[PDB]
Structure formats: C-alpha cells, structure tokens
Amino acid sequence: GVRKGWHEHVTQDLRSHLVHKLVQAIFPTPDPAALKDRRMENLVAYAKKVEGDMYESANSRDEYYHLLAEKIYKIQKELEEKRRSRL
Amino acid sequence: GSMSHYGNQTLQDLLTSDSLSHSDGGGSGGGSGGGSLECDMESIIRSELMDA
C-alpha cells in the first residue's frame, strides 16, 4: 500500500464499522451473534478484502466510504429484490 | 462514490448515522425471519469472496 495522507483520517473504528455493515448487507443477520458464527470468518474475510480494496482505491476516507456505500447499497437491494420479487 | 441512481441517500444517511454519529456499533442485527435468505446471492458471493 502506498502512503496516502488521508489514511490517518480514518481509524480502525470507522473502517471496521463499515466492514461490519458490509457483512450486515451481504448477510441479513437475525442477531448480532450470527456475526460471530462460522459464516462470519468468511463474510468478514469478504468484507475485509472488499474494504481494503476500496480503502486503497480511494483518495479520501469519505470517498472510500462513498464508493463502498455504493457497492453495499446495490448488493442490498440486489439480494432483496431477487429473492423477494423477481423469482 | 458512484451513484448512477441518485437515490443513495437512504444508505449514505444510514452509514452517516451508524458509523459517524453513533461511531461504534459492531453488534447489530435485525433479520426478522432469519438470515439465510441470500441463497442464490451466495453464488455470486462465492465468486466475490474467492479472490482478494
């Protein structure tokens, strides 16, 4: 990873929180304890790869947040409409 | 970020509230009826999770 001055403007808390949402979107968790299930290692792995990718892709944490909020957005509605009304 | 569809404010505001305003919230759930509905979604998910 290259040294981007903006990464000092984003702490683990914010990013790990966004990682958490990535999981909450991909996996409509019934209970916060399903976020510590065996599927979690996999979802959080996906979320970390995803988060890290966009973290490195952006030039501001807000941008990285934005573009990630975009992919998570579409993922949410994708799963919702597919499973609900297109089938 | 992308917003081809400009109606992203719902999701952006959600994040703004949870992540920024509330700051910490790494324990949240709300899947009424369960959370294993992904099903077909898991297929593309396998595709996405496979490679970094």
Write the DSSP assignment of B1-52 as a string of letters.
Answer: ---SSS--HHHHHHHIIIIIIS---------TT-S---TTHHHHHHHHHH--
Number of domains in chain A: 1
Task: Please tell me which residue of chain A has the smallest CA distance to B27.
Answer: A32
Domain extent, residue A82, equals: 1-87
In this structure, what CATH number is given to the domain that contains residue A14?
Answer: 1.10.246.20
Structural domain boundaries of chain B? Answer: 1-52
Q: What is the distance in angstroms between the Cα of B26 and the nearest Cα belonging to chain A?
A: 6
Approach to solving: NMR
Contacts of B26 (CB under 8 A, 6+ apart): A16, A17, A20, A35
Angle between helices A12-26 and A61-81 (to 10 degrees): 10
Tokens at residue B48, please? Answer: 């996405």
H helices, E strands: number in chain B: 2, 0
Give the C-alpha separation, A27 to A13, whole Å.
20
Q: Determine contact, residues B49/A45, Cβ cutoff 8 Å.
A: yes
∠ at Cα B38 (B33, B42), nearest 5°? 155
Chain B partners within 8 Å of A29 (Cβ): 28-31, 35
> Greatest CA span in chain B, whole angstroms?
34
* B13 reaches A (C-beta below 8 A): no
Give the C-alpha separation, B37 to A1, whole Å.
36
- Of the partner residues B25, B34, B38, the one whose CB lies closest to the CB of residue A30: B34
